[PDB]
Motif scaffolding. Structure first.
Motif, mmCIF file in Angstrom:
data_model
loop_
_atom_site.group_PDB
_atom_site.id
_atom_site.type_symbol
_atom_site.label_atom_id
_atom_site.label_comp_id
_atom_site.label_asym_id
_atom_site.label_seq_id
_atom_site.Cartn_x
_atom_site.Cartn_y
_atom_site.Cartn_z
ATOM 1 N N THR E 13 0.835 -1.201 0.000
ATOM 2 C CA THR E 13 0.000 0.000 0.000
ATOM 3 C C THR E 13 0.866 1.246 0.000
ATOM 4 O O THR E 13 1.976 1.243 0.529
ATOM 5 C CB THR E 13 -0.955 0.012 1.196
ATOM 6 O OG1 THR E 13 -0.234 -0.044 2.405
ATOM 7 C CG2 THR E 13 -1.929 -1.160 1.153
ATOM 8 N N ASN E 15 0.737 5.804 0.254
ATOM 9 C CA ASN E 15 0.024 6.974 0.748
ATOM 10 C C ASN E 15 0.787 8.219 0.311
ATOM 11 O O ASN E 15 1.817 8.566 0.891
ATOM 12 C CB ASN E 15 -0.129 6.888 2.269
ATOM 13 C CG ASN E 15 -1.051 7.968 2.799
ATOM 14 O OD1 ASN E 15 -2.264 7.855 2.709
ATOM 15 N ND2 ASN E 15 -0.500 9.021 3.363
ATOM 16 N N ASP E 76 -5.690 14.022 0.031
ATOM 17 C CA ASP E 76 -4.780 12.904 0.190
ATOM 18 C C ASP E 76 -5.055 11.872 -0.895
ATOM 19 O O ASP E 76 -6.117 11.872 -1.524
ATOM 20 C CB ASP E 76 -4.928 12.290 1.591
ATOM 21 C CG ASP E 76 -3.694 11.490 2.016
ATOM 22 O OD1 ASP E 76 -2.659 11.580 1.328
ATOM 23 O OD2 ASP E 76 -3.770 10.794 3.050
ATOM 24 N N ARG E 78 -4.258 7.510 -2.005
ATOM 25 C CA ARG E 78 -3.908 6.168 -1.548
ATOM 26 C C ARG E 78 -3.873 5.220 -2.727
ATOM 27 O O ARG E 78 -4.509 5.457 -3.755
ATOM 28 C CB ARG E 78 -4.907 5.679 -0.490
ATOM 29 C CG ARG E 78 -4.752 6.375 0.865
ATOM 30 C CD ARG E 78 -5.832 5.910 1.841
ATOM 31 N NE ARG E 78 -5.669 4.494 2.209
ATOM 32 C CZ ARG E 78 -4.866 4.028 3.146
ATOM 33 N NH1 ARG E 78 -4.105 4.817 3.859
ATOM 34 N NH2 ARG E 78 -4.825 2.746 3.382
#
Lengths: 399, 119, 607, 525, 181
Positions: E13, E15, E76, E78
């Motif tokens: 993952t 970010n 943001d 992701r």
RNA sequence: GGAAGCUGGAAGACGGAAUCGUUAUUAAGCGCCAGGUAGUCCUGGACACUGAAUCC
RNA sequence: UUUUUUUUUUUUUUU
RNA sequence: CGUAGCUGUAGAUGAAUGCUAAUUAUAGAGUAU
RNA sequence: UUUUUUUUUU
């Protein structure tokens, strides 16, 4: 009549129907008959498929009595009450003793009287008289001719409780009385076996005598030697005391002997278990907020026992629940008395039957104009339900 | 319409019993343990005997008795104003069930040992 | 009539009965149509539409006949089936030309099914297709359910009694009328049982005879890739479209309707009224079949025992002359249900058996030959019975099957003792000598499928099979195994036995052969050439199950493994070859079963 | 109700029912366990292996069964008496909790526990006996009558228990004292109760006077098939006066009321088995009726085998000779009778008569044997009777096979003693070594040694033989020889007790080493 | 046994706080592929995780009656990746970490698997006689589809259990219980 | 400081006059929480459903 | 679904 | 989720909710009538 | 705006 004739309306005379049903129409049919402007118009009832299966069973049951025939009641779950408007009048026309009670809750949510007793069953003197008065309107000319047995004379208490069950409430009171009185014989070792046995023998002798002198049940001394079952006019005269004892006497009498076929129909049976509108001090903390359960009363309890249908050697019982007075929810059928093999689950009206219902109202001058183009369009709107079909078409012009 | 339990017929205040068939809310739990204090005291074997007067049946229905029951029951359903959204109160039967089973209180229906459960 | 101007209430007392007496094929119907051609022509924009199409079919029916298929292979596909269906039923140097025409009709009949199923038939064509199959006795387990829905939706339609006839001329020369309303009401009782006794099972149903099978529940497996991945900046992607495309996950499932069960319930009530009418024995057989259902009627209403009791009461009170001919069909259906009035019903049916066999010559071979033929095709309308005997070459080939199923029906009962021990010996000896002369070849050999039906009954009724082994020396090993291998690596062995139960299905997987090993074990129940033949049979069937002894049902695996570690079983079979290491494999999977006491059910103790 | 049951005929003969409902029982819900148990009760065949599986799992799953469910499950055990050593631990673990002051459970619990093995003093007897003696003020008339049959079958009773029921009937019967109200209500509750207590050799002064008829002119009491109760109660130690008011009646001396074939011969015969009565000069007239009744074909294959088996004991009361009427005058073509249901009943009858023939004058006295030709004729019947049972052996229930072993082992003594043809195959395959569900015996609570008990396979299906007490305890004219090799008093009725006791002693010496056995343990009649 | 373990899956993952920074990581990760020893390189699947945002509020110049407001948006980004049958740990872990650029953190999630008793049975089958009485696409994962389905179901089960348990143990003033004092 | 039981005879049916403005998922009603780093508002910020009319 | 159910709807998600 | 639909009560001339011998919760401390 | 169950009723 037969399988070929399904979903048709049978004409009924206005005057003949009233005599056959003195109490009133079965179900909410009274709301639909008042809409017809014509006063001389007949009343029609649809012959659903659910009635054909039930009607055939009754035919074989009558012929046998003259283990193949059914000896238990049924239950309609899911238009369950619509068949009652056609099954009761037909049976009564065939010399059948039918007990009619479309509104049994009237004796539990109205002005009445309650008197607590040791048996723990509340009685209603005011409502007890109306039960027999309404039943004798059309069932007359037969109860008087029917004989009365001698084996069930007077073994019922004032509240309709049996002698064996009523005397059990006083067991606790008598238990303490004998314990204190045993000191006379306890105080005068011998083999350590016979001395104790002899003392215990005194309890049996005293208990037998105590269970036959303190209790004085009322054995309907007002009528020493009866001759029939309909000749009990003293019940209607006295209401303060003799109101519930006579009610249960007739109920028990119609199980033992077998001379005529009987039938009992109790509508809206889903509103007898829930709590009543009464108030008392019998609540279990917060279970009822100080209310008397409906099934704890006298009259509702008489029509709240399906497991006893086996004792009915003459006929059988039947009940149905279709109204929205209470949400059915799960509606457990196993913990109530009926079995999974005796539940008739009806479904919504088929398209074939829907067309006939609409055409029936046209002949009665109910609707203004119902074009055939929109006939099938309205089927999806209300979904074919009887309650949603009559209301939707009544509010609007229809079609 | 205005049913108790909502759409899913929730019940976060009742406790079921393994034996027999009988359920009651947490409100009646306090009264049951206090009334049956003689059995609990004798089971184990003055400061210890402080709640003896509260065992009276008639005293509980008086003005003084009404306040004692309400003091112990803090109404766990009521909380702070900020406890909104995911921070919602849960069923407090977990704590009540432990005390009711450890104290060995007889059931009103049938005289039995610890048989209560969450439900 | 009453004085109030209404119908007298006394008339509505009882329920009327149903008919369904007449029954004719599609053969004689066509002959009448070709004769009354000059009289049938006597009979708005839609005026021409209902006339132009309505007369073209009349002249054609008597698409270029029964020739010119493939290219031609809409109502076109429906009318073509009539010609083929009617040609086949006509049968009911010379064997060369006849076979050429017979084969063509059968091949073309199946080809038309592919195009028929691909298009949903209308109400006006669904009944015609179904009716044709019944006459020809050619049903389909895949097509029957599809056509059953159309006959139900239209039956309960609003326009049922008011609507006129269908425009095919087939309804013109028909007893009933009023379009589909009364057409189905006067349907023969023989065809009514089909709707009630309809198999709704799918092909995936294999957990009963075949063995274990895990069904899938996730066909679609959507996986992304690198070339079709959404960009990081998804906000601008929505602005580059004409309309909303991506939406939250919302999918609607399919809900199954009555699937023809609503119509079946109505048909069941018709059979009830046709019991107290004192009708023929042949017509009464249909009532039992409907009452003996197991997947449609269920037990919703308490009418099944009542109808069965009434049927038995009337059946008992009948002459033996009309009951003797009808004994296989009645006993086969009546034995599938248990009721209080069971012992009394079966006692009467057993007495007629003694006289039926004695008068037929069973302990002048023409008496026994003609009797069997009537019971096999003439009596059973369309029923499919134990081993699929359903509606002679040299000797004792067809009559043997009839007698084989009869014994199993009487031993199936679960109310009282099946019969007497003396009767069993007499019955067993009746077929003992008959099967001896059964031509000791060809494909006309008794398969294991029908053989296992008889062996199954003896394994549950508590009756031990007799020492006679002549029945085992004329079946199975004789030609059912050698012929299979004659007709056309480690992994190759598994496919060899698997191919057996693919198309012809000589056996019901692990259903019929499963009891074969158990019966051969217990036969000579006491113990301190029959011995030689038993060893050969046990070993032959054991090697055909071991290779595939990994995908079978656990219940079936226990029986196979149980009947190997016994004293009756031959030695040198439990060695460390395929069985020693395979035994612990089953125990590890199911440790809850008894391990030390494996041979306790039917081990060295016999039973 | 209209009973109905459907079979799993989805594929018309696929799978195996006995195997199908075998593995699922290992992992199933508590409710499903009870449903599957009822299937075996009504089943045709019985599998001994399956019986043990259900018993073992019952103890583990006893933590979720409601009190009503336990009683219902125990009720199904009445037929085909079967039990396991692990079953007693399950019932004992919840019997105390079931004590909620029940009115009817006092009889249902006691009747169910009468069979198998019970009477466990410091687990079961202490709470049951303590709660039944103090609850004598609420017993119904119907329940009291049924309790008489229960206490009669018990062993080693106590004075407090017996006296509790004795005084209950005296007061209960007095209420009804002050034609159907006495002929079928008063007399019925008097003789039935007296017989129950008479088995335990117990009686009081305030029961005999009231039970007997005060007035000698009280005729028309009971029919021929009910008057035997009064006679059976007396003739025990010193009882008399009840039999007839002066040995001169009007319906029990001149061939009763009326004996005929109208469903009356069987009723009287059945009543003579459970009542310890010997056919006197007046009661011997029943045997004569058999000669004419047997002539009819209908009676020859409807009640003939049942009557012979149910009255085999007391040879000089039913049959003129042991081989004359026991032969096959016309049974060659009529031997078959409902496969095995009645055929097995003939095998047992032929075995009991054999024991009486030998033990007549060879050290037992009390008679003499017949001519040697009688044995030759008897062997001709057994030889052709055992063969027919070979193919029908699987059609016998658990109870049917249990009693077969007792009558089968008898033929293995006389034959080899110094013969039957099928004695080397049928008698040495299964009849000699049976492995059916062995039930527990009925032991008393007098020894007080329940802490050291065991089980050994033998003829009486299980016994009490522990390792610590192994081979060590349980293992004049009527005591010397009658208490030795015979060891059977002529109370009860010995013809059956002697056969079972003698076989037990031999079976425990041939296989096991068990010496110094003290039989005792003679149950009431 | 430690030697019997194997990396079943590795969920990777990301970010990122910027659009451009996230795009650079995708290109860097792709360039690291198509260079391993095996014919087909490991091709992980894509799984976007939306784009959370936050924006507090404040009154707006001082000495005002709250007539205007000024917001400060803080977006943001992701991204999530899936792996299956990671035979080479060095060629996958190094590539994922080496594709970072700027303020772009990562959070891996290992997933091991231990095999039980190796099924070894079914010897040479018996035999007798009668008695006579490739297709690999460019941008696709080389792993079998059956393996992914078996592993995918396990991930969905753990997520449901964690959410249910986490909700239970979530109340204000931790350590407080009713009528405890 | 917030909420709750019990108790209850706090002050109000005045005025169709007049002043504050809405560019339709506007107006009018009803329901929920995110932050304010223990609790602590009828204002402000922020989301969702029913949702009419006029000459603007 | 004629042995099937026994029923109101929200402000991120089946990538 | 709230006004739901549906359905019982009185088709309210009498539904205003503040005042307080008295307790529920946070906090080291919010107490006295 | 509120449902029965571990059994002692001819």
């Amino acid at each position: 009549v037969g399988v070929e004739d399904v979903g048709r309306f049978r004409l009924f005379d206005r005057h003949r129907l009233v005599e056959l049903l003195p109490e009133g129409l079965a179900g909410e049919l009274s709301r639909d008959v008042e809409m017809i402007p014509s006063a001389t118009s007949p009343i029609g009832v649809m012959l659903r498929k659910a009635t054909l299966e039930l009607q055939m069973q009754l035919e074989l049951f009558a012929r046998v009595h003259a283990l193949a025939a059914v000896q238990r009641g049924f239950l309609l779950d899911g238009g369950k009450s619509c068949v009652l408007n056609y099954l009761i009048p037909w049976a009564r026309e065939n010399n059948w003793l039918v007990v009619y009670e479309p509104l049994p809750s009237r004796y539990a949510r109205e002005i009445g009287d309650i008197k607590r007793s040791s048996a723990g069953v509340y009685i209603q003197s005011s409502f007890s008289q109306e039960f027999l008065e309404r039943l004798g309107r059309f069932n007359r000319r037969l109860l008087e001719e029917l004989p009365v047995a001698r084996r069930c004379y007077g073994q019922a208490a004032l509240d309709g409780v049996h002698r064996l069950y009523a005397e059990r409430s006083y067991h606790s009171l008598l238990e303490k009385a004998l314990e204190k009185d045993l000191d006379e014989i306890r105080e005068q070792l011998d083999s350590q076996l016979r001395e104790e046995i002899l003392l215990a023998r005194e309890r049996l002798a005293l208990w037998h005598t105590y269970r036959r002198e303190v209790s004085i049940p009322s054995m309907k001394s007002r009528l020493p030697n009866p001759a029939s079952v309909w000749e009990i006019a003293e019940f209607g005269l006295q209401n303060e005391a003799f109101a519930t004892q006579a009610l249960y006497e007739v109920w028990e009498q119609l199980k033992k002997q077998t001379q005529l076929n009987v039938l009992i129909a109790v509508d809206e049976w889903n509103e007898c278990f829930p709590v009543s509108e009464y108030v008392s001090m019998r609540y279990e903390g917060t279970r009822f907020n100080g209310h008397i359960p409906a099934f704890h009363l006298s009259t509702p309890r008489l029509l709240s026992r399906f497991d006893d249908a086996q004792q009915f050697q003459r006929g059988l019982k039947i009940c149905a629940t279709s109204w929205r007075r209470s949400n059915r929810r799960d509606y457990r059928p196993d913990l109530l008395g009926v079995r999974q093999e005796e539940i008739r689950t009806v479904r919504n009206f088929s398209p074939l039957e829907f067309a006939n219902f609409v055409a029936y109202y046209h002949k009665k001058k109910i609707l203004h104009e119902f074009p055939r183009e929109k006939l099938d369009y309205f089927y999806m709107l209300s979904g074919g339900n009887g309650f949603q079909a009559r209301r939707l078409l009544a509010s609007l012009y229809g079609g | 319409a205005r049913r108790v339990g909502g759409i899913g017929r929730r019940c976060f205040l009742t406790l079921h019993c393994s034996a027999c068939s009988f359920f009651f809310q947490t409100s009646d739990a306090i009264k049951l343990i206090l009334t049956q204090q003689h059995h609990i005291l004798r089971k184990k074997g003055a400061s210890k005997f402080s709640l003896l007067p509260l065992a009276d049946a008639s005293l509980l229905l008086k003005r003084r008795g009404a306040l004692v029951l309400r003091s112990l029951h803090g109404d766990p359903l009521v909380g702070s104003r900020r406890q909104r959204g995911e921070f919602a109160p849960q069923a407090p039967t977990a704590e009540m069930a432990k005390m009711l089973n450890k104290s060995c209180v007889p059931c009103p229906r049938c005289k039995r040992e610890g048989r209560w459960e969450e439900g | 009539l009453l004085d109030t101007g209404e119908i007298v209430p006394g008339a509505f007392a009882s329920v009327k009965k149903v008919g369904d007496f007449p029954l004719l094929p599609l053969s004689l119907l066509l002959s009448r149509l070709k004769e009354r051609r000059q009289e049938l022509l006597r009979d708005f924009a839609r005026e021409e539409e209902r006339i132009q199409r309505k007369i073209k079919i009349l002249e054609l029916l008597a698409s270029q006949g029964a020739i010119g298929d493939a290219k031609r292979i809409h109502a076109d596909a429906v009318n073509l089936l009539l010609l083929l269906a009617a040609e086949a039923e006509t049968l009911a140097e010379e064997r060369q030309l006849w076979r050429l025409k017979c084969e063509g009709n059968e091949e073309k009949w199946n080809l038309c099914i592919s195009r028929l199923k691909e298009l949903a038939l209308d109400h006006e064509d669904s009944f015609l297709v179904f009716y044709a199959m019944c006459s020809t006795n050619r049903f389909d387990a895949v097509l029957l359910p599809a056509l059953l829905e159309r006959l139900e939706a239209s039956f309960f339609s609003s326009q049922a009694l008011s609507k006129p006839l269908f425009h095919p001329i087939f309804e013109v020369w028909d007893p009933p009328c009023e379009s589909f309303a009364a057409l189905i009401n006067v349907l023969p009782l023989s065809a009514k049982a089909v709707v009630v006794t309809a198999d709704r099972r799918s092909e995936r149903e294999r957990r009963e005879n075949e063995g274990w099978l895990a069904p899938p529940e996730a066909p679609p497996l959507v996986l992304p890739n690198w070339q079709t991945m959404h960009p990081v900046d998804m906000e601008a992607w929505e602005k580059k479209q004409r309309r909303v495309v991506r939406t939250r996950h919302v999918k609607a499932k399919i809900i199954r309707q009555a699937d023809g069960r609503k119509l079946a319930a109505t048909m069941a009530l018709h059979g009830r009224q046709a019991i107290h009418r004192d009708a023929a024995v042949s017509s009464l057989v249909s009532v039992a079949a409907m009452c003996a259902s197991n997947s449609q009627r269920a037990l919703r209403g308490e009418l099944l025992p009542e109808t069965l009791n009434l049927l038995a009461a009337e059946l008992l009170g009948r002459s033996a002359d009309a009951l003797s001919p009808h004994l296989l069909s009645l006993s086969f259906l009546l034995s599938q249900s248990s009721v209080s009035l069971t012992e009394r019903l079966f006692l009467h049916l057993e007495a007629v058996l003694r006289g039926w066999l004695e008068e037929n010559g069973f302990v002048a071979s023409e008496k026994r030959r003609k009797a069997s033929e009537e019971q096999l095709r003439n009596l059973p309308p369309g029923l499919n019975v134990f081993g699929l005997v359903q509606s002679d070459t040299e000797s004792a080939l067809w009559e043997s099957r009839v007698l084989a199923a009869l014994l199993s029906s009487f031993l199936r009962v679960d109310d009282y003792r099946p019969s007497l021990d003396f009767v069993l010996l007499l019955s067993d000896a009746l077929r003992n000598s008959l099967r001896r002369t059964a031509v000791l070849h060809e494909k006309d050999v008794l398969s294991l499928k029908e053989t296992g039906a008889l062996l199954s009954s003896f394994a549950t009724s508590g009756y031990a099979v007799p020492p006679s082994l002549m029945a085992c020396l004329v079946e199975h090993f004789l030609y059912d195994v050698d012929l299979f291998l004659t007709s056309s690596s480690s992994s190759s062995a598994e496919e060899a036995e698997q191919l057996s139960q693919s198309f012809f299905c000589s056996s019901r997987g692990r259903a019929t052969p499963g009891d074969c090993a158990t019966l051969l074990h217990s036969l000579a129940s006491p113990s301190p050439n029959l011995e030689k033949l038993r060893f050969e049979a046990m070993t032959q069937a054991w090697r055909l199950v071991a290779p595939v002894l990994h995908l079978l049902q656990p219940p079936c695996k226990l029986l196979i493994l149980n009947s190997l570690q016994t004293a009756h079983a031959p030695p040198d079979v439990s060695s460390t070859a395929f069985f020693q290491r395979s035994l612990e494999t089953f125990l590890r999977d199911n440790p809850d079963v008894d391990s030390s006491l494996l041979g306790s059910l039917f081990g060295t103790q016999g039973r | 109700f209209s009973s109905l049951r459907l079979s799993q005929k989805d594929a018309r003969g696929s799978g195996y029912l006995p195997a199908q409902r075998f593995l699922s029982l290992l992992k199933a819900s508590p409710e499903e366990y009870r449903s599957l148990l009822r299937e075996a009760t009504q089943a045709k065949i019985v599998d001994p292996a399956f019986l043990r599986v259900a018993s073992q799992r019952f103890f583990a799953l006893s933590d979720r069964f409601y009190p009503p469910e336990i009683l219902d499950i125990l009720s199904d055990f009445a037929s085909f008496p079967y039990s396991d050593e692990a079953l007693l631990a399950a019932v004992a673990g919840r019997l105390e909790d079931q004590l909620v002051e029940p009115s009817p459970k006092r009889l249902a619990a006691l009747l169910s526990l009468s069979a198998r093995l019970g009477l466990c003093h410091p687990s079961i007897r202490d709470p049951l006996t303590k709660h039944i003696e103090e609850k004598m003020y609420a017993f119904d008339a119907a329940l009291l009558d049924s309790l008489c049959r229960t206490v009669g079958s018990l062993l080693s009773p106590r004075l407090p228990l017996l006296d509790g029921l004795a005084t209950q009937a005296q007061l209960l019967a007095s209420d009804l004292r002050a034609d159907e109200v006495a002929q079928r209500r008063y007399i019925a509750l008097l003789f039935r109760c007296l017989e129950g207590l008479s088995r335990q050799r117990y009686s009081q002064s305030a029961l005999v006077d009231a039970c007997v008829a005060c007035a000698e002119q009280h005729g028309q009491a009971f029919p021929l098939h009910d008057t035997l109760r009064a006679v059976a109660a007396a003739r025990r130690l010193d009882l008399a006066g009840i039999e007839e008011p002066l040995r001169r009646s009007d319906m029990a001396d001149k061939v009763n009321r009326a004996t005929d074939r109208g469903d009356q011969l069987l009723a009287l015969l059945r009543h003579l088995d459970l009542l310890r009565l010997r056919d006197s000069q007046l009661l011997q007239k029943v045997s004569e009726a058999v000669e004419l009744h047997s002539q009819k074909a209908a009676f020859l294959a409807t009640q003939l085998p049942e009557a012979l088996l149910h009255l085999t004991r007391l040879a000089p009361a039913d049959l003129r000779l042991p081989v004359a009427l026991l032969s096959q005058p016309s049974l060659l073509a009529m031997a078959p009778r409902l496969s095995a249901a009645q055929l097995q009943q003939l095998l047992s009858a032929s075995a009991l008569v054999l024991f009486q023939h030998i033990q007549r004058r060879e050290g037992g006295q009390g008679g003499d044997p017949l001519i040697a030709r009688e044995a030759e004729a008897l062997a001709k019947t057994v030889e052709r009777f055992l063969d027919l049972l070979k193919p029908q052996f699987l059609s016998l229930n658990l109870r049917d096979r249990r009693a077969l072993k007792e009558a089968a082992s008898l033929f293995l003594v006389e034959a080899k003693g110094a013969a039957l043809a099928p004695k080397t195959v049928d008698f040495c395959c299964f009849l000699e070594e049976a492995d059916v569900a062995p039930p527990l015996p009925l032991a008393p609570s007098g020894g007080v040694d329940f802490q050291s008990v065991g089980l050994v396979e033998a003829c009486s299906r299980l016994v009490l033989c522990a390792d610590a007490r192994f081979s060590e305890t349980r293992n004049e004219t009527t005591t010397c020889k009658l208490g030795g090799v015979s060891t059977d008093l002529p109370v009860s009725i010995t013809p059956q007790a002697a056969s079972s006791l003698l076989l037990t002693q031999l079976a425990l010496i041939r296989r096991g080493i068990l010496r110094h056995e003290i039989q005792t343990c003679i149950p009431p009649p | 046994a430690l030697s019997a373990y194997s990396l079943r899956s590795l969920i990777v993952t990301y970010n990122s706080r910027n659009r451009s920074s996230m795009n650079a990581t995708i290109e860097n990760l792709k360039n690291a592929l198509r260079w391993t020893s095996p014919s087909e390189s490991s091709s992980p699947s894509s799984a976007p995780s939306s784009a959370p945002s936050s924006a507090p509020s404040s009154s707006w110049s001082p000495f005002k009656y709250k007539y205007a407001l000024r917001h400060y948006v803080f977006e943001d980004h992701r991204y999530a990746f899936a792996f299956y049958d990671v035979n080479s740990v060095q060629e996958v872990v190094s590539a994922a970490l080496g594709a970072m650029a700027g303020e772009t953190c990562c959070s891996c999630r290992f997933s091991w698997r231990f095999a039980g008793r190796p099924p070894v049975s079914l010897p040479t089958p018996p035999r007798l006689v009668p008695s006579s009485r490739a297709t690999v696409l460019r941008g696709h994962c080389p792993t079998d589809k059956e393996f992914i389905r078996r592993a995918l179901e396990e991930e969905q089960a753990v997520e449901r259990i964690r959410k249910k348990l986490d909700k239970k143990q979530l109340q204000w003033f931790p350590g407080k219980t009713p009528w405890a004092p």
